[PDB]
Amino acid sequence: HKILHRLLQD
Amino acid sequence: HKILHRLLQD
Amino acid sequence: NSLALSLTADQMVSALLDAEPPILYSEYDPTRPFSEASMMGLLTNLADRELVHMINWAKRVPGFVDLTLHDQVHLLECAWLEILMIGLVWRSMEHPGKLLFAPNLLLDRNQGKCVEGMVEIFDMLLATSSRFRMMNLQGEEFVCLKSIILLNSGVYKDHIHRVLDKITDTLIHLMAKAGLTLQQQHQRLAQLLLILSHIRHMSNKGMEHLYSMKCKNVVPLSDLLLEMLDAHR
Amino acid sequence: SLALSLTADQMVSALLDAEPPILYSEYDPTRPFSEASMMGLLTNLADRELVHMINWAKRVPGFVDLTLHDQVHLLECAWLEILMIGLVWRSMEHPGKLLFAPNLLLDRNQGKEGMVEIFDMLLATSSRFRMMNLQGEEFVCLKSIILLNSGVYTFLKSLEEKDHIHRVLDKITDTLIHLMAKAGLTLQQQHQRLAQLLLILSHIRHMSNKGMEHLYSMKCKNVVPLSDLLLEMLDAHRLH
Ligand SMILES: Oc1ccc(C(=Cc2ccccc2)c2ccc(O)cc2)cc1
Numbered sequence: 282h283k284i285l286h287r288l289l290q291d
Numbered sequence: 292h293k294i295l296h297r298l299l300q301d
Numbered sequence: 302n303s304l305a306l307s308l309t310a311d312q313m314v315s316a317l318l319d320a321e322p323p324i325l326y327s328e329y330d331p332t333r334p335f336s337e338a339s340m341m342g343l344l345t346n347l348a349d350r351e352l353v354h355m356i357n358w359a360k361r362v363p364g365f366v367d368l369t370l371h372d373q374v375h376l377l378e379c380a381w382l383e384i385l386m387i388g389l390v391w392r393s394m395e396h397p398g399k400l401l402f403a404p405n406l407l408l409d410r411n412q413g414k415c416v417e418g419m420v421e422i423f424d425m426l427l428a429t430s431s432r433f434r435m436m437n438l439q440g441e442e443f444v445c446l447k448s449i450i451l452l453n454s455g456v457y458k459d460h461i462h463r464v465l466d467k468i469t470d471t472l473i474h475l476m477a478k479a480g481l482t483l484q485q486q487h488q489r490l491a492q493l494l495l496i497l498s499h500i501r502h503m504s505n506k507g508m509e510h511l512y513s514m515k516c517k518n519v520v521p522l523s524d525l526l527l528e529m530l531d532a533h534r
Numbered sequence: 535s536l537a538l539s540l541t542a543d544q545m546v547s548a549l550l551d552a553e554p555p556i557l558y559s560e561y562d563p564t565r566p567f568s569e570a571s572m573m574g575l576l577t578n579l580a581d582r583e584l585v586h587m588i589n590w591a592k593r594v595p596g597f598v599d600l601t602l603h604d605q606v607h608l609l610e611c612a613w614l615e616i617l618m619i620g621l622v623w624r625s626m627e628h629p630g631k632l633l634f635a636p637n638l639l640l641d642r643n644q645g646k647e648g649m650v651e652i653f654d655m656l657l658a659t660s661s662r663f664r665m666m667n668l669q670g671e672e673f674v675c676l677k678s679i680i681l682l683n684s685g686v687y688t689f690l691k692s693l694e695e696k697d698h699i700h701r702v703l704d705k706i707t708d709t710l711i712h713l714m715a716k717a718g719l720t721l722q723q724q725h726q727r728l729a730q731l732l733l734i735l736s737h738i739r740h741m742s743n744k745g746m747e748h749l750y751s752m753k754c755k756n757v758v759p760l761s762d763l764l765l766e767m768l769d770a771h772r773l774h
């Protein structure tokens with residue numbers, strides 16, 4: 282999804 | 292020059 | 302030297318309670334708003350009348366009279382919408398899902414929807430009211446919070462901070478009096494003050510909307526409301 | 535969770551260990567640069583800090599116990615508040631100066647407008663921390679409070695999660711009082727200082743709101759480029 286969403290997930 | 296000035300000194 | 306610092310806690314509470322402005326009414330027509338014009342018209346008219354009472358309420362907040370006229374002007378210009386809003390939230394406590402702008406004017410989400418960029422602020426206001434309700438916010442605490450907003454929001458000198466300290470003492474005094482443990486005391490104090498961050502947020506968002514309503518030039522603003530709004534540009 | 539079972543000293547050590555590094559900017563004192571370039575440096579700086587902030591936030595006790603969608607919302611709401619309090623903290627021992635980075639100290643002289651407005655507020659807040667003699671231990675507490683508090687009222691049973699946040703916030707309050715008591719402050723002094731610190735968060739919210747509005751109009755002018763992440767963080771706030 283969003284970049285923030287991605288970075289949090291990683 | 293300001294209504295607030297007037298109302299405050301009452 | 303300011304008399305405010307010489308008051309006892311009870312004297313501070315009594316002074317703030319008796320300085321409380323009255324709950325004003327809106328126009329007595331039965332048509333529930335809808336449309337930006339009628340809703341914003343009623344709210345603006347109401348805010349304009351409340352401001353006159355706020356100004357005289359502020360003069361009776363201990364320590365406020367000791368400030369220079371210019372400082373008094375600055376604090377009111379900065380804090381006015383925060384103060385209107387916390388009052389609104391306070392009044393709306395016992396009406397979940399509703400915003401009691403005036404006893405004859407209760408609004409909900411769906412009427413906020415009929416004004417663009419308004420339902421967001423309504424929801425924030427409603428959320429703050431629920432927060433007050435779940436915290437069982439008391440009248441004595443409310444008037445303390447409201448006066449803190451007046452003195453704090455435009456402060457950024459040492460007189461104000463000394464008066465702010467004394468209101469803190471007063472809040473603790475009420476919680477200790479209400480039987481709270483020492484841990485419940487500082488925890489509740491923190492909870493109360495953190496809400497002021499959200500109230501500030503709601504004010505800034507509200508101010509942006511009033512500026513937009515100002516440019517639209519369809520809803521008439523009083524010269525006073527105009528100058529308070531202008532002070533934020 | 536582990537967040538609720540932490541002692542005050544453990545909480546502090548956890549927050550201290552989770553601290554993001556102080557990044558450098560690309561400031562070159564030989565570059566004449568204008569002020570679409572200055573905002574370029576700050577924007578570049580903010581974008582790199584954001585990557586560290588996200589990883590820092592995952593180490594704030596209680597934060598990862600939240601759903602991903604609530605983690606996103608909290609950071610979207612608080613990112614500028616958090617950058618700003620970091621800026622204000624770093625600038626404490628530089629009166630009249632804002633230490634955006636070790637190689638970037640700006641006074642109010644250089645800095646456009648509504649820009650100088652925000653600078654002045656950041657300077658005053660930094661002055662405030664200095665006169666209060668804010669401690670590093672108190673700073674990390676305040677910063678985590680911002681993360682957890684700022685977006686909590688703009689989020690069933692997604693209500694129970696609001697409660698886990700409130701419980702953690704209460705623990706951070708306990709931790710702050712613990713620090714002040716250890717500093718030798720009387721009960722009246724602890725309560726007063728606690729209030730003084732939290733009132734500052736109202737001003738940090740204010741500076742964030744004003745900053746967000748400046749960033750939004752700076753975007754519409756399209757003279758400086760916002761990074762992809764910053765654009766998305768900005769979109770979450772909308773207006774005007
Ligand atoms: O011209 C105005 C219109 C609404 C308001 C306002 C609320 C508001 C302002 C902007 C956006 C959303 C709500 C309000 C709050 C509390 C009151 O007791 C009375 C009025 C203030 C000024």
Ligand SMILES: Oc1ccc(C(=Cc2ccccc2)c2ccc(O)cc2)cc1
Binds near residue numbers: 577579617618652760
């Ligand atoms: O695109 C951006 C530019 C500046 C800033 C900013 C401050 C700012 C933003 C808007 C208006 C005025 C200052 C900042 C604050 C702390 C930092 O560690 C890094 C950058 C943030 C984002």
